[PDB]
PDB file of C-alpha atoms and ligand atoms in Angstrom:
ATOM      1  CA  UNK A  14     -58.864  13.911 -58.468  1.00 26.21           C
ATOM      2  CA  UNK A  15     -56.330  13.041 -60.891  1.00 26.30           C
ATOM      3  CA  UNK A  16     -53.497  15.912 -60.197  1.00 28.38           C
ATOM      4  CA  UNK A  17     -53.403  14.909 -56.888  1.00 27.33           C
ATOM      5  CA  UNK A  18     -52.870  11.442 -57.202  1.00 26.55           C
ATOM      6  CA  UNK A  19     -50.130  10.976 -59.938  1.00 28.90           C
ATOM      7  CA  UNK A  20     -48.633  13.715 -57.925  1.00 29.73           C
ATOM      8  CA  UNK A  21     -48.991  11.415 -54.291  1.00 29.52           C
ATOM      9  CA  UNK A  22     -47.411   8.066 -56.469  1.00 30.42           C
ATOM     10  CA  UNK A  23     -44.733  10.373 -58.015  1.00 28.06           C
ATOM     11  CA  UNK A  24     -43.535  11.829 -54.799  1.00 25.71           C
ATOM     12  CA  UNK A  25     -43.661   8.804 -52.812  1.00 26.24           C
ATOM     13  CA  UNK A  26     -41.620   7.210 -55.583  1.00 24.14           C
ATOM     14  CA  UNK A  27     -38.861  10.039 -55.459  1.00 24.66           C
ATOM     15  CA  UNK A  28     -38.937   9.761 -52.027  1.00 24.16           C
ATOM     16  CA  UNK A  29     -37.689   6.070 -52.248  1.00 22.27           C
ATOM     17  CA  UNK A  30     -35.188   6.993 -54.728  1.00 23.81           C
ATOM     18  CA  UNK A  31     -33.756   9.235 -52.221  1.00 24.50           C
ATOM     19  CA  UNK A  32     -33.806   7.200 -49.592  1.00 23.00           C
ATOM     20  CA  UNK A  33     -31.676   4.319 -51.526  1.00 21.38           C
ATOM     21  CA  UNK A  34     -29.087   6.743 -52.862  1.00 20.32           C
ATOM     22  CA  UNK A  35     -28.491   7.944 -49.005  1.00 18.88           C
ATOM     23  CA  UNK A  36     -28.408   4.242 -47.884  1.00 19.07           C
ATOM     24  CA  UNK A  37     -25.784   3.656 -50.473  1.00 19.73           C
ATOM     25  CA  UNK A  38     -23.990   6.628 -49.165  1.00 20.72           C
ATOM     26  CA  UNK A  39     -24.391   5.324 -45.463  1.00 24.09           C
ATOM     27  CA  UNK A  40     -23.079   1.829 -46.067  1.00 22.79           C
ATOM     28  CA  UNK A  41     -20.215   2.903 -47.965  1.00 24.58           C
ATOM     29  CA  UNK A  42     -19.276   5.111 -45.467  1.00 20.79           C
ATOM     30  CA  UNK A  43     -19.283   2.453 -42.826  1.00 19.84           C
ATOM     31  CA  UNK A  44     -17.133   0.433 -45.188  1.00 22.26           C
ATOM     32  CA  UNK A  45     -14.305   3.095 -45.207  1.00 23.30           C
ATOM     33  CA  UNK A  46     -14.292   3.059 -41.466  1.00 21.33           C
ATOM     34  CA  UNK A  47     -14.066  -0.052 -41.210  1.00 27.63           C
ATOM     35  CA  UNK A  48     -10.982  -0.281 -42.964  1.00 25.35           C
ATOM     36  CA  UNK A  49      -9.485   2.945 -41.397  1.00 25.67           C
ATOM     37  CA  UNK A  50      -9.996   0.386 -37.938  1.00 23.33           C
ATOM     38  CA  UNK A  51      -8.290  -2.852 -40.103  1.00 21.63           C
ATOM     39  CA  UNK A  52      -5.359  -0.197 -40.853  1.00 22.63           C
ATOM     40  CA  UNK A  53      -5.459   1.058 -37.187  1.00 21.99           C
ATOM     41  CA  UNK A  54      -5.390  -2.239 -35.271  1.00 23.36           C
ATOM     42  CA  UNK A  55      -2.447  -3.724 -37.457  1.00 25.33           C
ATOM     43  CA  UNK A  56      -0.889  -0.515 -36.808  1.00 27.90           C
ATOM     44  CA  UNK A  57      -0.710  -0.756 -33.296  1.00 29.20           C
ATOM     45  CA  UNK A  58       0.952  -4.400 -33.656  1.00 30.17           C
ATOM     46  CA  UNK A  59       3.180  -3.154 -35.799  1.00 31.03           C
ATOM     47  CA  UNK A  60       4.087   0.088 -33.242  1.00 29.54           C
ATOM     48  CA  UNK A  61       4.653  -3.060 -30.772  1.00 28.19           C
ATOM     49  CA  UNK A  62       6.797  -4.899 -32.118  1.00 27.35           C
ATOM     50  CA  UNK A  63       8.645  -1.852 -33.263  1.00 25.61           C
ATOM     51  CA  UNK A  64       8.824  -0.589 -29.474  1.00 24.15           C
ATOM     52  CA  UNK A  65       9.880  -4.416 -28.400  1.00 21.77           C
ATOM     53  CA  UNK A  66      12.975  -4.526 -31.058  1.00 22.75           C
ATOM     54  CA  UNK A  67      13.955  -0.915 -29.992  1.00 22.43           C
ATOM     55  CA  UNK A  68      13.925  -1.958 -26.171  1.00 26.08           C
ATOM     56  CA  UNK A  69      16.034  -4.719 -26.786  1.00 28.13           C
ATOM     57  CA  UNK A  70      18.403  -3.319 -28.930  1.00 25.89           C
ATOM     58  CA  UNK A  71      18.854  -0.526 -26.480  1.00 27.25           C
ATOM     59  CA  UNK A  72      19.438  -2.775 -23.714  1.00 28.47           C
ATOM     60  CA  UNK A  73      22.150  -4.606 -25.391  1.00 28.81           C
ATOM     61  CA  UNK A  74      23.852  -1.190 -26.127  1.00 26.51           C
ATOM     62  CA  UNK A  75      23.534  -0.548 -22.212  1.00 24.82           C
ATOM     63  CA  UNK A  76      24.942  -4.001 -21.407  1.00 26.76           C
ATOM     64  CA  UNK A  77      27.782  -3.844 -23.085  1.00 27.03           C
ATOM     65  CA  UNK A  78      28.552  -0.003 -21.725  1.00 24.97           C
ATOM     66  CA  UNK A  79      28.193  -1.381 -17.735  1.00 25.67           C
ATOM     67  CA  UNK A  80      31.580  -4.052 -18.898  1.00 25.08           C
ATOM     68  CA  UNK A  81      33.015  -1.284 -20.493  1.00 26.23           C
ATOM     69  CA  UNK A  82      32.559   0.338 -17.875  1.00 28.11           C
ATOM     70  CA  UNK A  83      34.005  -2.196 -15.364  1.00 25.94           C
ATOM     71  CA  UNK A  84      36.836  -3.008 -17.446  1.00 25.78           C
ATOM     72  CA  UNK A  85      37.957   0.836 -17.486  1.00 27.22           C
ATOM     73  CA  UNK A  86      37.436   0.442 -13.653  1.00 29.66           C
ATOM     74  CA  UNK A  87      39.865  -2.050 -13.211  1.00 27.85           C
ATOM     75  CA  UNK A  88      42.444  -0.469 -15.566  1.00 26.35           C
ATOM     76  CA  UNK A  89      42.139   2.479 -13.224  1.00 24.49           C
ATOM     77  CA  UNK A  90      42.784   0.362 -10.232  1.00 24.67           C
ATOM     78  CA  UNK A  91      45.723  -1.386 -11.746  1.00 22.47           C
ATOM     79  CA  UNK A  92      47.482   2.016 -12.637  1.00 18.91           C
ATOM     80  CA  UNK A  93      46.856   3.112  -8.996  1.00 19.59           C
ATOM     81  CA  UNK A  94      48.221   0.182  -7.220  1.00 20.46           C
ATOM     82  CA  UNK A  95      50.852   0.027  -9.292  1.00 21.87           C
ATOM     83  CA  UNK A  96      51.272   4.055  -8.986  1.00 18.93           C
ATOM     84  CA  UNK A  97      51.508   2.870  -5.303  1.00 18.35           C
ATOM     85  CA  UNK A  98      54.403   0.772  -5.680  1.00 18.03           C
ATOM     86  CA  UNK A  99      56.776   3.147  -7.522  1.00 18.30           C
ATOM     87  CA  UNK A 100      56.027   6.218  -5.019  1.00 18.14           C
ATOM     88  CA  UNK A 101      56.733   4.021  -2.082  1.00 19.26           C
ATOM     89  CA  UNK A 102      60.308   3.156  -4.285  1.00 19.99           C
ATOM     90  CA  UNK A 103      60.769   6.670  -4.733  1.00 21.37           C
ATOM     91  CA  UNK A 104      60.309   7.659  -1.234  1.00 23.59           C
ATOM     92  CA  UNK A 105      62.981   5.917  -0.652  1.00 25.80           C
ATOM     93  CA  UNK A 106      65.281   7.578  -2.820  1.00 25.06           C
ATOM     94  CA  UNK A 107      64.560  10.603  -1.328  1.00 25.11           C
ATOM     95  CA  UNK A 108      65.516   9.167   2.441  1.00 25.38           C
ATOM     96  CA  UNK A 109      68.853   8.970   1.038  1.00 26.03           C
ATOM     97  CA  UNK A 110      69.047  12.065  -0.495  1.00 25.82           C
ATOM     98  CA  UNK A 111      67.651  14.288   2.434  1.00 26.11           C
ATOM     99  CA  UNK A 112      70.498  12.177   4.562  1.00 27.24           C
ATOM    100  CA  UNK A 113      73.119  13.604   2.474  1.00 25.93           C
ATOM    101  CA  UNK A 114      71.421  16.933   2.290  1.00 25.19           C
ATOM    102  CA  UNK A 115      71.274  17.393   6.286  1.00 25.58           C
ATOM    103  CA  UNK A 116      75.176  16.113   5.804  1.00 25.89           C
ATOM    104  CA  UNK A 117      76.014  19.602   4.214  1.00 28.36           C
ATOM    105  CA  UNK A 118      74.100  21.686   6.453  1.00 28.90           C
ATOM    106  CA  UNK A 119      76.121  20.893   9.456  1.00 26.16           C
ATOM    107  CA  UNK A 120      79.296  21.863   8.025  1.00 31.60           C
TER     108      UNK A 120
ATOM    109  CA  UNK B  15     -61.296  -1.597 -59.176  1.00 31.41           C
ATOM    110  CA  UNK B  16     -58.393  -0.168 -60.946  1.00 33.61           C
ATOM    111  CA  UNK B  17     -58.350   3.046 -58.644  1.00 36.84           C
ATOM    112  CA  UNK B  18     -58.311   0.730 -55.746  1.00 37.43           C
ATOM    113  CA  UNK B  19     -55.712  -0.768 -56.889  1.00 35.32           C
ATOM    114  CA  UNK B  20     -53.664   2.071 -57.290  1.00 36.96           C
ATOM    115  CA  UNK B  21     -54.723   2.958 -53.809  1.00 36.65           C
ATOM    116  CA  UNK B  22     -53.540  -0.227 -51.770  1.00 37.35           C
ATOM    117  CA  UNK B  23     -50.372   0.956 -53.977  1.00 35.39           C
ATOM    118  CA  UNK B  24     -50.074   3.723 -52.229  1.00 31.21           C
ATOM    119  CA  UNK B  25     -50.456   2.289 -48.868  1.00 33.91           C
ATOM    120  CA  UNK B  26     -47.850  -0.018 -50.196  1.00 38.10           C
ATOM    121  CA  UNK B  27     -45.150   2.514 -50.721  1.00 39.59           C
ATOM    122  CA  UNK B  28     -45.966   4.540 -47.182  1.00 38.64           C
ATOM    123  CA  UNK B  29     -44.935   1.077 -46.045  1.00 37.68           C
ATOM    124  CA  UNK B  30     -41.702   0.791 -48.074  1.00 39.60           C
ATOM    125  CA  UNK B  31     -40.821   4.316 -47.110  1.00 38.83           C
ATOM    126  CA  UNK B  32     -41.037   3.324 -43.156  1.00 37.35           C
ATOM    127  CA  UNK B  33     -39.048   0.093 -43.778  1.00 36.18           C
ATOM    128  CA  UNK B  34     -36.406   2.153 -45.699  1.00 38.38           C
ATOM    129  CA  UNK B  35     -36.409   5.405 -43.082  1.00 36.66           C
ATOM    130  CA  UNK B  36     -35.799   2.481 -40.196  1.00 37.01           C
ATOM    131  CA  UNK B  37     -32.856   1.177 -42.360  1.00 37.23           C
ATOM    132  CA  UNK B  38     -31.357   4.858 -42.658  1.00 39.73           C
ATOM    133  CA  UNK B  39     -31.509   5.313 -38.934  1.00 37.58           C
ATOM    134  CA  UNK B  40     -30.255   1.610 -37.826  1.00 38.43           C
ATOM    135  CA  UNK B  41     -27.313   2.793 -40.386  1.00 37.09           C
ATOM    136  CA  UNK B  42     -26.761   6.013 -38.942  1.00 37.35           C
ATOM    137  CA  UNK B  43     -26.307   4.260 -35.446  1.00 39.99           C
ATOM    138  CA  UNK B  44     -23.685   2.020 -36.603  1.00 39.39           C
ATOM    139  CA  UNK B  45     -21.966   4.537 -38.463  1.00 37.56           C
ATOM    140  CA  UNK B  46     -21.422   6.086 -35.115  1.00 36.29           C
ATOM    141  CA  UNK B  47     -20.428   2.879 -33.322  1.00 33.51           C
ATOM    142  CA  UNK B  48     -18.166   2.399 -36.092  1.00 31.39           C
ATOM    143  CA  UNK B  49     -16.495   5.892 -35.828  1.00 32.35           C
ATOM    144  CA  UNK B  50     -16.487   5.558 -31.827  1.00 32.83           C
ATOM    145  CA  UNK B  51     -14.622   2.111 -32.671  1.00 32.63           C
ATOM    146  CA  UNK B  52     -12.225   3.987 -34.445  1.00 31.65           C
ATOM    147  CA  UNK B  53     -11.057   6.691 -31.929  1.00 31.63           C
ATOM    148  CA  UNK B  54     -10.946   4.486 -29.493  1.00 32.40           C
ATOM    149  CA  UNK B  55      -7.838   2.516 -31.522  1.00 31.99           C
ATOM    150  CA  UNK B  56      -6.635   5.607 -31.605  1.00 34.34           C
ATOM    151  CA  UNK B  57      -5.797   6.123 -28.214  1.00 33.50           C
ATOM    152  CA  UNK B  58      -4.788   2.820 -27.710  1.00 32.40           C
ATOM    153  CA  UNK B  59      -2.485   3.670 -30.734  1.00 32.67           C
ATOM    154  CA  UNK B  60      -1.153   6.684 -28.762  1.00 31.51           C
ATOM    155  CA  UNK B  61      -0.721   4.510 -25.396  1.00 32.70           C
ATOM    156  CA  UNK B  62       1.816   1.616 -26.731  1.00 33.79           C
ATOM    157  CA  UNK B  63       3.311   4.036 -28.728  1.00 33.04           C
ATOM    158  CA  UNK B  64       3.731   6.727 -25.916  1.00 35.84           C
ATOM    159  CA  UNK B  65       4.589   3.706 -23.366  1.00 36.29           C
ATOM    160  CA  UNK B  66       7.229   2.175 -25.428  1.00 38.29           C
ATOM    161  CA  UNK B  67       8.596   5.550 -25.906  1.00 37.08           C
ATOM    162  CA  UNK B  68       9.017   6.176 -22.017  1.00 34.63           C
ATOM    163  CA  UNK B  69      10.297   2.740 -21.542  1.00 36.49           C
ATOM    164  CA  UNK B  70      13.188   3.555 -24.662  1.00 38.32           C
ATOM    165  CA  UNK B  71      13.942   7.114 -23.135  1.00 37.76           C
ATOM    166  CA  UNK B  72      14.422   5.504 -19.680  1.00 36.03           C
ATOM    167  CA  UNK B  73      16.947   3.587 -21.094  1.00 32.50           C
ATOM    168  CA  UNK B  74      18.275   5.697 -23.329  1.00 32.10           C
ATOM    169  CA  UNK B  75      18.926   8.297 -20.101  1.00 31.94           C
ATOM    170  CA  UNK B  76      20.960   5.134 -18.929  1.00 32.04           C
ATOM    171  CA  UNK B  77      23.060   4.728 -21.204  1.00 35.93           C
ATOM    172  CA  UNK B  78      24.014   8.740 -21.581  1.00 39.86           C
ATOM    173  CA  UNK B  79      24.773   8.735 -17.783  1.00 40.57           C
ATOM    174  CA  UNK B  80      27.337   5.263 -18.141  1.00 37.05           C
ATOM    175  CA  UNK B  81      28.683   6.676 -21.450  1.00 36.55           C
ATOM    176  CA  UNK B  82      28.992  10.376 -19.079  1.00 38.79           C
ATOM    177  CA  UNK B  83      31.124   8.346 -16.604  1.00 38.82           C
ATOM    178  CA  UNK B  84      32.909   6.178 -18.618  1.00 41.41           C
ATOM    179  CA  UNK B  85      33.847   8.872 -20.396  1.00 44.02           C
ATOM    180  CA  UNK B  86      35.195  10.564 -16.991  1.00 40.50           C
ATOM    181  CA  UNK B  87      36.911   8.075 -15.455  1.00 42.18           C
ATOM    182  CA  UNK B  88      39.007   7.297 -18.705  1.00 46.03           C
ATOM    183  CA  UNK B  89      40.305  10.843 -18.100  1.00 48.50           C
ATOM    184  CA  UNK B  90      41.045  10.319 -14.771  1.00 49.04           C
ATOM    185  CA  UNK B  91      43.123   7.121 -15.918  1.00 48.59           C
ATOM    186  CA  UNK B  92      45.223   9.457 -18.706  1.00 51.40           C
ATOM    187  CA  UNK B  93      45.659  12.330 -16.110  1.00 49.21           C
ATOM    188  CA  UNK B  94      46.839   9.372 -13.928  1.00 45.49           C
ATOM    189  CA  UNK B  95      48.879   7.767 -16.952  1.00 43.82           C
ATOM    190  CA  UNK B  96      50.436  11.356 -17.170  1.00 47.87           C
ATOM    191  CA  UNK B  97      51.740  11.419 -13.208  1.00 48.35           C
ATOM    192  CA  UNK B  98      52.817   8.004 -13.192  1.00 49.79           C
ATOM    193  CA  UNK B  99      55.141   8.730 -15.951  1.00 52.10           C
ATOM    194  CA  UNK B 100      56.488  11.772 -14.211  1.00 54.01           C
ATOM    195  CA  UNK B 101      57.016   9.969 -11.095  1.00 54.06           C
ATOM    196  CA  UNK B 102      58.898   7.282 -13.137  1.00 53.32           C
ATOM    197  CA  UNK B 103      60.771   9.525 -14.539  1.00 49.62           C
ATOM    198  CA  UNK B 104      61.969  11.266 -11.667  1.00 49.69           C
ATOM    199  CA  UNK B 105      62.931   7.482  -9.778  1.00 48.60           C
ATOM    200  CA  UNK B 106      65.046   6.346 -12.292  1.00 44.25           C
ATOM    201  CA  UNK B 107      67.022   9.778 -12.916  1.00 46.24           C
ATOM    202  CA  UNK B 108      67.475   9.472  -9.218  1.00 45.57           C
ATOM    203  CA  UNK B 109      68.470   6.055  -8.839  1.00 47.86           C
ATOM    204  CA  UNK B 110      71.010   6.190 -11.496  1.00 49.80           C
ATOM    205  CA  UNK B 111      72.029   9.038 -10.559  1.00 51.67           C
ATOM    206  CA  UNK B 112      72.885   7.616  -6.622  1.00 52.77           C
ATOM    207  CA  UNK B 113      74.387   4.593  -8.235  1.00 52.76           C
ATOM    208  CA  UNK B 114      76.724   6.552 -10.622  1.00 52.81           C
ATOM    209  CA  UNK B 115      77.759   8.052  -7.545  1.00 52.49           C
ATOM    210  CA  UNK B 116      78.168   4.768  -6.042  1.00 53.67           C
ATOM    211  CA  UNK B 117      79.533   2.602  -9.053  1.00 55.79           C
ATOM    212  CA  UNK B 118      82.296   5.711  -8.790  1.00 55.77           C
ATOM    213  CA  UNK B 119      83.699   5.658  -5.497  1.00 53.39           C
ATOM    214  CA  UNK B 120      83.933   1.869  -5.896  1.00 48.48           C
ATOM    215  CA  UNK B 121      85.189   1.776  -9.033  1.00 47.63           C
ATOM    216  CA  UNK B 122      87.648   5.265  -8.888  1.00 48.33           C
TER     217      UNK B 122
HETATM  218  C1  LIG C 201      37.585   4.272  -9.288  1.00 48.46           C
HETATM  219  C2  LIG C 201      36.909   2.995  -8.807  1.00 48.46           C
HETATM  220  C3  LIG C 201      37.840   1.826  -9.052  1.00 48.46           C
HETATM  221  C4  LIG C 201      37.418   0.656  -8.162  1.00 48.46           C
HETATM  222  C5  LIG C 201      37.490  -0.647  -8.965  1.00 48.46           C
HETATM  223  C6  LIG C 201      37.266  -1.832  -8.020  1.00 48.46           C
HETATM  224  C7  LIG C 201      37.331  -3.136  -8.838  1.00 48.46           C
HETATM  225  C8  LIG C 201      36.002  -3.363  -9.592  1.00 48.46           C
HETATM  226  O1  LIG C 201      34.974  -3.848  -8.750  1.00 48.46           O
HETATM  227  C9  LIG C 201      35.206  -5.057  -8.166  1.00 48.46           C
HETATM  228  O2  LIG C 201      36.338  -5.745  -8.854  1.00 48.46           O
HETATM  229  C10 LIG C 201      36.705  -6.946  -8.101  1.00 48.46           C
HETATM  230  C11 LIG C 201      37.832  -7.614  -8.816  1.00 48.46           C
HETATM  231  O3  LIG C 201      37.784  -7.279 -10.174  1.00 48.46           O
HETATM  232  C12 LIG C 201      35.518  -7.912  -7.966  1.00 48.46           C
HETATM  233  O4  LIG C 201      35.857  -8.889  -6.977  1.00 48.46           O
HETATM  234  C13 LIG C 201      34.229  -7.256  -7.559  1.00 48.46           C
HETATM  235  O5  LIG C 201      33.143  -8.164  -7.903  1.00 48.46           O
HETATM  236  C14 LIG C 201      33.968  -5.945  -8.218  1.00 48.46           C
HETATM  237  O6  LIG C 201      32.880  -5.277  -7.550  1.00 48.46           O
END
């Protein structure tokens, strides 16, 4: 019967029509994500070396604190001993003084 | 013969139609892979970024604690500055002081 043939070829053509258009689609798709991935994996090398330069700058920033650090040690000690020095110096001073002081008391 | 033809046609194109369906799904499937692909960079994305981040702050917590103490023990050195010059003060107005004194009865 006619109608129902032309109607079977038509449909079954459409059909295929369909079918390529959503193929296109698909493949496409899976294009894109591939390059999203491309993007991703040269982003995560980048992010490394990134994270690497960061790590060593911070390092050398911290390296030269700990001999600042030292240094401003040393100046400390310095100032003591010689603090040291001048109170022992002093305390002699004073011997005399108190010597001359305990001179008046006795009257 | 014609009709027959068209017939073996259409036998033809239920073929074509399973080829193409089993395209669509081996397409679908990689899609998926694809997309699976992809989140997995992700997190590796978010694991050297997140471990280099640790590894900076650890650091960075060093160098706030040396600059912290640094920054006290200059302090300490200016307080320490400050009563060293007091001290030195007070020794030479007594020691010139004594040897005025002294200078005097020797020299009076
Ligand atoms: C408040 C703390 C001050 C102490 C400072 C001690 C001196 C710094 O430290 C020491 O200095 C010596 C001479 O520079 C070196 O022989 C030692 O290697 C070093 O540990």
């Amino acid at each position: 019967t006619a109608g129902r043939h032309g109607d079977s070829v038509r449909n079954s053509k459409i059909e295929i029509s369909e079918l390529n258009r959503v193929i296109q689609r698909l493949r496409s798709e899976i294009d894109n994500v591939k390059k999203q991935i491309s993007n991703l994996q040269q982003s995560i090398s980048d992010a490394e070396q990134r994270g690497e330069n960061a790590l060593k700058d911070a390092k050398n920033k911290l390296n030269d604190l700990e001999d600042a650090l030292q240094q401003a040690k040393e100046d400390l000690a310095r100032l003591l001993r010689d603090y040291q020095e001048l109170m022992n110096t002093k305390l002699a001073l004073d011997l005399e003084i108190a010597t001359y002081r305990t001179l008046l008391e006795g009257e | 013969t014609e009709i027959d033809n068209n017939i073996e046609q259409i036998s033809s194109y239920k073929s074509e139609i399973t080829e193409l369906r089993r395209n669509v799904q081996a397409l679908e499937i990689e899609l998926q892979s694809q997309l699976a692909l992809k989140q997995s960079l992700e997190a590796s994305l978010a694991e050297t970024e997140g471990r280099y981040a640790v590894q900076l702050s650890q650091i960075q917590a060093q160098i706030s604690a040396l600059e912290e103490q640094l920054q006290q023990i200059r302090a300490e050195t200016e307080c320490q500055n400050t009563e060293y010059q007091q001290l030195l003060d007070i020794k030479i107005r007594l020691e010139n002081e004594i040897q005025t004194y002294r200078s005097l009865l020797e020299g009076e």
